[PDB]
Design a protein around this ligand. Structure first.
Ligand code: NI
Length: 341
């Protein structure tokens, strides 16, 4: 049955709630982003209205074959009316097409659902700035002070410089980047750009990327692996066996692989700076795990909440254990006492 933290009180609405069958009293289903833990349950047989971003709607139509008549894309940063309730979609700084949802309830309550997000100070100047928010349904993935990670910019700088140095030293090295869902496209695109190559990938992955409105994409991606020196593979294949096997397949075009695994966080973060990151190496294969996050760090999350000053916080992540819930609730209280709301 649908959990309480996916239901919006005083509306017929649910958020990311497609795996529970027909939810009692739900008149419209919102989807924040195209990641499987959130869309789980959608298909061509779905006949309720789905409300989402334009990019998310392209992916529902093309990847899951949801029929067009049930897809309701909304423009970002625009006041829209859904079953008599004003809503706004805001950029979540997560994967492409990912949104936060503002709901203006008929009784005057205002609710922000962040979906998945990486908090940023740029959000303090959207339509959020213009009114009070009473309830916040918060992406608490990394809600503990041990979760620190660098900016996305520093991590891409590291990756570009590492790939450029390696291929310049050896023009017969191949670069491989792991992927398993949309998000983190800057990793592979930035590396292909510095090397003057396109990124080569499966037809299925190319189809997914063509759904995303990324400018000049026909310019950076391809299905012709032979013409590319940056290849994308499934995240599961980013290990020494899987990469040795791939290198065989390239027919003696290459004699070395440098691979990147973008992770969220890893406890090497508690001790090491990005500048200091080193690979795991075996023979002619090196693997770099880089901390490219599309979720808020603890400090980013804290700053956002202390800016927004909500009356009530409802965590949507890590809610399954009493120890996690208690830990999160203690931080929410700290934040409120420190900021004075
Ligand atoms: Ni996500």
């Amino acid at each position: 049955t649908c959990p309480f933290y996916k239901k919006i009180p005083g509306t017929g609405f649910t958020v990311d709630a497609f795996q529970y069958g027909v939810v009692e009293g739900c008149t419209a289903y919102f989807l924040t982003h195209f990641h499987s833990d959130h869309y789980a349950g959608l298909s061509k047989h779905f006949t309720f209205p789905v409300y989402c971003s334009e990019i998310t709607g392209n992916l529902l139509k093309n990847k899951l074959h949801v029929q067009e008549q049930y897809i309701h894309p909304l423009p970002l940063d625009t006041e829209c009316i859904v079953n008599g309730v004003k809503v706004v979609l805001l950029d979540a700084n997560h994967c492409p097409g990912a949104v936060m949802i503002l709901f203006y309830l008929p009784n005057g309550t205002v609710i922000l659902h962040t979906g998945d997000f990486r908090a940023d100070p740029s959000m303090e100047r959207s339509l959020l700035a213009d009114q009070k928010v009473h309830m916040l349904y918060l992406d608490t993935t990394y809600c503990s002070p041990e979760y620190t990670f660098p900016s996305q910019q520093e991590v891409i700088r590291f990756a570009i410089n590492t790939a450029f140095e390696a291929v310049t030293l050896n023009p017969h090295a191949l670069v491989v980047c792991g992927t398993y869902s949309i998000g983190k496209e800057k990793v592979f695109l930035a590396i292909a750009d510095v090397l003057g190559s396109k990124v080569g990938m499966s037809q299925e992955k190319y189809k997914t990327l063509q759904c995303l409105n990324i400018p000049e994409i026909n310019s950076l991606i391809t299905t012709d692996m032979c013409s590319s020196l940056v290849h994308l593979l499934p995240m599961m294949q980013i290990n020494f066996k899987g990469l040795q096997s791939h290198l065989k397949k390239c027919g003696g075009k290459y004699n070395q692989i440098l691979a990147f695994r973008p992770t969220g966080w890893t406890h090497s973060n508690k001790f090491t700076r990005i500048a200091d990151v080193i690979p795991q190496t075996k023979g002619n294969i090196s693997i770099y795990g880089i901390p490219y996050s599309e979720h808020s760090s603890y400090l980013e999350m804290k700053r956002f909440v202390q800016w927004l000053k909500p009356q009530k916080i409802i965590p949507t992540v890590n809610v399954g254990t009493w120890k996690s819930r208690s830990t999160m609730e203690k931080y929410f209280r700290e934040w409120k006492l420190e900021a004075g709301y």
